[PDB]
From a paper:
In addition to housekeeping NusG, diverse bacterial paralogs, typified by E. coli RfaH, activate long operons that encode antibiotics, capsules, toxins, and pili by inhibiting Rho-dependent termination, an activity inverse to that of NusG. Contacts with the ops element in the NT DNA are thought to trigger domain dissociation, transforming RfaH into an open, active state in which the NTD can bind to RNAP; consistently, destabilization of the domain interface enables sequence-independent recruitment.
The DNA binds to a basic patch on RfaH-NTD opposite the RNAP/RfaH-CTD binding site and forms a hairpin structure. The hairpin loop comprises G4-A7, with T6 flipped out so that its nucleobase is completely exposed. Base-specific interactions with RfaH-NTD are made by G4, G5, and T6; however, only G5 and T6 form a hydrogen-bond network with RfaH-NTD that may underlie sequence-specific recognition. Thus, contacts between only two nucleobases and four amino acids mediate specific recognition of ops by RfaH. The stem of the DNA hairpin is formed by base pairs C3:G8 and G2:C10, with T9 being flipped out. The G2:C10 base pair is likely an artifact of crystal packing as the stems of neighboring DNA molecules stack on each other and could not form in a TEC that contains a 10–11 nt bubble. However, this idea is refuted by our observations that domain interface remains intact in the binary complex, implying that additional interactions with RNAP or nucleic acids relieve autoinhibition.
Numbering used by the authors: 1 to 97, 118 to 155
Write the structure that this text describes.
DNA sequence: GCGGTAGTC
């Protein structure tokens, strides 16, 4: 069925990966966040990638193979849970536009002004939320 | 790992 995954893109190739993935009918998602940063010693508002160089993608792994995504121009790799691509729970995706760990994990993400910290937070939250869906 | 929308690489 349609599932969401999380890819890392090659340095500066994100827009390229979005291109080639969308060409293959894979839905792409690279959320931005508007926040107050310092620019020329003045506090101002900027829009920047919520999770730099990461891209959420949605496709049916029975229609398009992960090996095909893993060979798409611009793509570096899947975020994995174990040895296989992490399937990002939809509750996580929903918080970009629900679980308690998810909810609070994103409260932390949305208030973290450094993108690399936001991504680290993201990876941890996806790990935790997937483990929580196990028996 | 690269180059790849893979790989009798």
């Amino acid at each position: 069925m349609q599932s969401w995954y999380l890819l890392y893109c090659k340095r500066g190739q994100l827009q390229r990966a979005q291109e080639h993935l969308e060409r293959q009918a894979v839905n792409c998602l690279a959320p931005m966040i508007t926040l107050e940063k310092i620019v020329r010693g003045k506090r101002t508002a900027v829009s920047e990638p919520l999770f730099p160089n990461y891209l959420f993608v949605e496709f049916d792994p029975e229609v398009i193979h992960t090996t095909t995504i893993n060979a798409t121009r611009g793509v570096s790799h899947f975020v994995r849970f174990g040895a296989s691509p992490a399937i990002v729970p939809s509750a996580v995706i929903h918080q970009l536009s629900i679980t308690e760990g998810a909810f609070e994990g994103f409260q932390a993400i949305f208030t973290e002004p450094d993108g690399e910290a936001r991504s680290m937070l993201l990876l941890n939250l996806i790990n935790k939320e997937i483990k929580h869906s196990v028996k």
